[PDB]
Amino acid sequence: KPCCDHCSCTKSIPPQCRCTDLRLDSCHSACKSCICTLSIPAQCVCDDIDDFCYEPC
Amino acid sequence: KPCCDHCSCTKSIPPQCRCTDLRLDSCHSACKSCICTLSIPAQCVCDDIDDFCYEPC
């Protein structure tokens, strides 16, 4: 489920945006590159770059 | 080498702070939990929580 509570974007055109959220167990559904701690519950980061931010969670 | 360009902190006492930086190849030297993409060059995130921010990079 694609949402982001904290998005960071560059100030250029096209903008470069990422979600810095750390989430439990898994990244949102639209995340293509999800990296996670090797523990349970997993703490996971999406590091996809996009020209937009997902809507707030 | 411990620095952070973007730190996020809660507004409570004690504060809870993390570095959201995505870095190439590895996390700073003081990072205890570093997670990284499986690619080269690796893109890595520290998700340590601390009651402080590292100084800017």
From Swiss-Prot, chains A, B:
Disulfide bonds join C3-C57, C4-C19, C7-C53, C9-C17, C27-C34, C31-C46, C36-C44. One of its GO terms (cellular component) is extracellular region. It comes from the Eukaryota. GO terms for molecular function: serine-type endopeptidase inhibitor activity. The keyword Disulfide bond applies. The record marks L38, S39 as: Reactive bond for chymotrypsin. The record marks K11, S12 as: Reactive bond for trypsin. Keywords: Disulfide bond, Protease inhibitor, Serine protease inhibitor. Transmembrane segments: none annotated. Belongs to the Bowman-Birk serine protease inhibitor family. Several variants were isolated from a commercial Lima bean preparation. Some lacked 8, 12, or 14 N-terminal residues and 2 C-terminal residues. This is Bowman-Birk type proteinase inhibitor. It comes from Phaseolus lunatus.
